[PDB]
Amino acid sequence: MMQQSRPASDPQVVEAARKEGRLIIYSSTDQSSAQALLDDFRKLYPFIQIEYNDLGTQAIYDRFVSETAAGASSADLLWSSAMELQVKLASEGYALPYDSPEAKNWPANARLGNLAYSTTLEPAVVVYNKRFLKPEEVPTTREGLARLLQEPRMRGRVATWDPERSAVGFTILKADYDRFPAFQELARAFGKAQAALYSSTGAAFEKVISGEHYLAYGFFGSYALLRQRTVKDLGIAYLTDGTVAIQRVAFINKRAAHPNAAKLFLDYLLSLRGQNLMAYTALIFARRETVVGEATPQALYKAVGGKDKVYAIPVSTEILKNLDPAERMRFLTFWRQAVR
């Protein structure tokens, strides 16, 4: 649905983007998942060449800060799941202020005024290998997963984030810790099962697919849906006690060489066309409710047993509390003691 519509970017912005002719993206969205968006954007605007830099969340931050400080060529658009890092940059002078004509109905907690925008509503899910755990054996609660991880067969068979090496692994597990008391019991059960910690979804998924691990906790439902299309052994379980949802944050570099191309791409991501392509084809869980496909808010809400079971991390300067050293210290001390 909406596959032929045109985002409402101002015609002067389209003409300015044509004069630029190029768009440099730094993104943590795996290119496997991003590629259909890039292809569809080029169908709309064939006069823009896209350079897609598929990078780690901490690496995007470090590279962009370093390049900016050097006065050097950097990204036009930054698109990352490490919400706190994106909100920090966009609240420190790095962002081009732009009021997207596609974001008029965004809630105030899904945008930083005109500086940065939510593009997705992506759940942290459980993935497992059906050869080793049947669907009916996989709990959908933190307390139930804690019980499963007492079992001898689960020792060495669990993957989760390393929040000390992945910035979004921090986002997700910090939010879980903050919102769900049962997270503490589950983290001790990660210690019991000798959970292996990964800095990327692909590294954890490769282990689940090989059966080195049976179950991975906290990775993106978007990537799981897309992997399941080619790996029929991959199962997905949604948490019914409460689901953390991240919002991938996009903003335009204030110092972009191609700011208008970046405007068009932001407006594309936020548009009904882009959000429908997420939900239907890319299998990225869309931010917009008015979407058709597998990767939709309605589908997430049905899977978890209602919208009130989803904690959507806001695109807000309030989330920078998570970067406070004492707040980071409390979480990481708890984590490191529980998972050892």
Question: Which residues carry a binding-site annotation for Mn(2+)?
Answer: 30
- According to the binding rule CB under 5 A, does residue 276 interact with Cl ion? no
- According to the binding rule CB under 5 A, does residue 66 interact with Cl ion? no
The residue among 94 and 205 lying less far from Cl ion, judged by its C-beta, is 205
Q: Which amino acid is at 178?
A: D
1 binds, among Mg ion, Cl ion, none (CB under 5 to 8 A by kind): none
CA atoms within 13 A on the CB side of 238: 22
- According to the binding rule CB under 5 A, does residue 28 interact with Mg ion? yes
Contact segment (CB under 5 A) with Mg ion among 21-29, 268-276, 305-313, 328-336 equals 21-29
Of positions 80, 271, 296, 322, contacts Cl ion by CB under 5 A: 271
Of positions 288, 304, 315, 338, contacts Cl ion by CB under 5 A: 288
Q: How far apart are CA 337 and CA 188, in angstroms?
A: 8
Torsion, Cα 19 119 29 329, to 10 degrees, reads: 130
86 binds, among Cl ion, Mg ion, none (CB under 5 to 8 A by kind): none
Whether the Cβ atoms of residue 93 and residue 116 lie closer than 8 Å to each other: no
Window 131-150: residues binding Mg ion (CB under 5 A): none
* Helices of type H across 211-314: 221-228, 259-270, 272-277, 297-304
Of positions 107, 135, 202, 211, contacts Cl ion by CB under 5 A: 107
The residue among 204 and 256 lying less far from Mg ion, judged by its C-beta, is 204
List CB contacts of 144: < 8 A, sequence separation 6 or more: none
> Which residues does residue 27 pair with via DSSP β-bridges, in sequence order?
54, 79
13 is written with which tokens? 């912005």
Closest CA to 218 of 282, 174, 156, 164: 174
- According to the binding rule CB under 5 A, does residue 176 interact with Mg ion? no
Of positions 13, 273, 278, 286, contacts Cl ion by CB under 5 A: 273
Closest CA to 212 of 223, 203, 222, 225: 203
Closest CA to 3 of 296, 285, 276, 297: 276
- According to the binding rule CB under 5 A, does residue 119 interact with Mg ion? no
139 is written with which tokens? 């709990």
Contact segment (CB under 5 A) with Cl ion among 4-12, 241-249, 279-287, 322-330 equals 4-12
- According to the binding rule CB under 5 A, does residue 5 interact with Cl ion? yes
Window 30-89: residues binding Mg ion (CB under 5 A): 30
Contact residues toward Mg ion (CB under 5 A) are 28, 30
Q: Could you list the residues that contact Cl ion (CB under 5 A)?
A: 5, 107-108, 198-199, 203, 271-273, 288-290
